[PDB]
UniProtKB/Swiss-Prot annotation:
In muscle, parvalbumin is thought to be involved in relaxation after contraction. It binds two calcium ions. AB domain, comprising of helices A and B, is involved in structural stabilization, protecting the hydrophobic core of the protein. It is required for high-affinity binding of Ca(2+) and for Mg(2+)-binding. Ca(2+) 2 binds at D90, D92, D94, K96, E101. GO terms for molecular function: calcium ion binding; identical protein binding; protein-containing complex binding. It comes from the Eukaryota. The modification Phosphoserine is found at S1, S7, S23, S65. PANTHER family: PARVALBUMIN ALPHA. Belongs to the parvalbumin family. Ca(2+) 1 binds at D51, D53, S55, F57, E59, E62. This is Parvalbumin alpha. One of its GO terms (biological process) is excitatory chemical synaptic transmission. Residues 38-73, 77-109 form the EF-hand domain. GO terms for cellular component: axon; cuticular plate; cytoplasm; neuronal cell body; protein-containing complex; stereocilium; terminal bouton.
Length: 109
């Protein structure tokens, strides 16, 4: 239910903004998609959509498919881009992103 939280306009814009020349940058992404302006509560609702298996964490598979949370046709991040985002978000080093870490990722964006 991402379009309950973010607009199709912003989602298109956010995904359409990166060329191959651009490093996928979650900071730019979360800004352009509209997530930085959402309440903390809506950021957590975004988190739970991303947490596809509802394990309470965004694990590395789910993280590589992050963009699919916003637009299901979007491609996965590459291994490298996925691990870059995991390095940014995974502050306790357990190899997955919890609720706090996800909010932090958005806050740092
Ligand atoms: Ca999960
Ligand atoms: Ca973690």
């Amino acid at each position: 239910s991402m379009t309950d939280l973010l607009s199709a306009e912003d989602i298109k814009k956010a995904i359409g903004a990166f060329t191959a020349a651009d490093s996928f940058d979650h900071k730019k992404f979360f800004q352009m998609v509209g997530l930085k302006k959402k309440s903390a509560d809506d950021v957590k609702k975004v988190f739970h959509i991303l947490d596809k298996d509802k394990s309470g964490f965004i694990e590395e598979d789910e993280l590589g498919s992050i963009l699919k949370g916003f637009s299901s046709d979007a491609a996965d991040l590459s291994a490298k881009e996925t691990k870059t985002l995991m390095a940014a978000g995974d502050k306790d080093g357990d190899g997955k992103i919890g609720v706090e870490e996800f909010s932090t990722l958005v806050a740092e964006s």
